[PDB]
Amino acid sequence: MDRYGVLAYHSVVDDTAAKEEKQYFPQTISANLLISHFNWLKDNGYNVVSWQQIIDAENGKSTLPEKAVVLSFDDGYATMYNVIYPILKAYNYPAVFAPVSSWLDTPVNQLIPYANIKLPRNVFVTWDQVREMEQSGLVEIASHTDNLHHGVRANPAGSQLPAVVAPEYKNNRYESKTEYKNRLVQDFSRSSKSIQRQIGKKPRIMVWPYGQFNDVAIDAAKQSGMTHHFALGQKIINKIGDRYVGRLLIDTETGFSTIKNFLD
């Protein structure tokens, strides 16, 4: 066919504990739930394809199988390497991984400023780990911004919005449209270079933090080679060649009927 679905995952842990009170990051699920999805896909005729097969399809080099599905993992959590990757290898499932590049670029001796707190560097993967995963041929490296996976103050009353989608209010004023666009263009361009130099491939997908984007962000990403962009459930079916790619956001309540209705 000419259609494909996309699933969006974040962290995956061995812990089967109920998660609501455990202080993980949002949308963290259990490895059992992940396996259940991986089993349900293959036992229902869904074929996991790599991003390369998508690109090969749009370029008229090969066709996709029926009920094509892409798997995607956001943020750069060490669980990508420690929990997810062994499972991808066991299933021979490829995937797209979107680490925040300034998090990875943080030296091992430093914490990562993250809203009100500072995180141990090994919450996240190292670049050695990313190289190994990419070299397997199973994992495509996408961008998830360099350092725009945070909020900015978006008004004088102290409202905070994702940095990608809001001119910043600081020094008692709003960014100019030109300042705001510049902020996205340079961050995205540093992300592309940060990934390229470790990995050998410029990323060719932008994955938006929190699913949120706009026209300025799209054009900023496009300028650095990321015309394909991954959002969340604001679009369900993707056709070969689409720039705007929708995804299902996975959470601990995502059961088979949820996945089925989406992929239907």
Known binding-site residue numbers for Zn(2+) = 10, 43, 74-75, 144, 149
Residue selected from 82, 147, 151, 211 as contacting Cl ion according to rule CB under 5 A: 211
Please count the other Cβ atoms lying within 10 Å of the Cβ belonging to residue 158: 8
Residue 86, burial from CB neighbour count under 10 angstroms (0-12, 13-18, 19+): exposed
Question: What whole-number distance in Å separates Cα of residue 56 and Cα of residue 62?
Answer: 6
Q: Are the C-beta atoms of residues 146 and 190 closer than 8 Å to each other?
A: yes
Which segment (31-39, 150-158, 208-216, 223-231) binds Cl ion by CB under 5 A?
A: 208-216
Residues in contact with Zn ion, counted by CB under 5 A, come to a total of 5
In 175-214, which ranges are continuous DSSP H helix? 177-199
H/E run at residue 130: helix 127-135
Min dist CB 137 to Zn ion, Å, is: 24
Min dist CB 98 to Zn ion, Å, is: 7
Q: Does 146 bind Zn ion (CB under 5 A)?
A: no
> Which residue lies nearer to Cl ion by CB, 151 or 211?
211
Question: What whole-number distance in Å separates Cα of residue 84 and Cα of residue 69?
Answer: 17
Question: What whole-number distance in Å separates Cα of residue 116 and Cα of residue 106?
Answer: 18
**Residues contributing to the annotated binding site:** 10, 43, 74-75, 144, 149
Residue selected from 30, 37, 75, 238 as contacting Zn ion according to rule CB under 5 A: 75
Taking residues 38 to 67 in sequence order and writing x for each that binds Zn ion by CB under 5 A, - otherwise, the string is -x---x------------------------
Query: What would the two tokens of residue 65 be?
Result: 């199988």
Min dist CB 248 to Cl ion, Å, is: 10
Give me the residues that bind Cl ion (CB under 5 A), please: 211
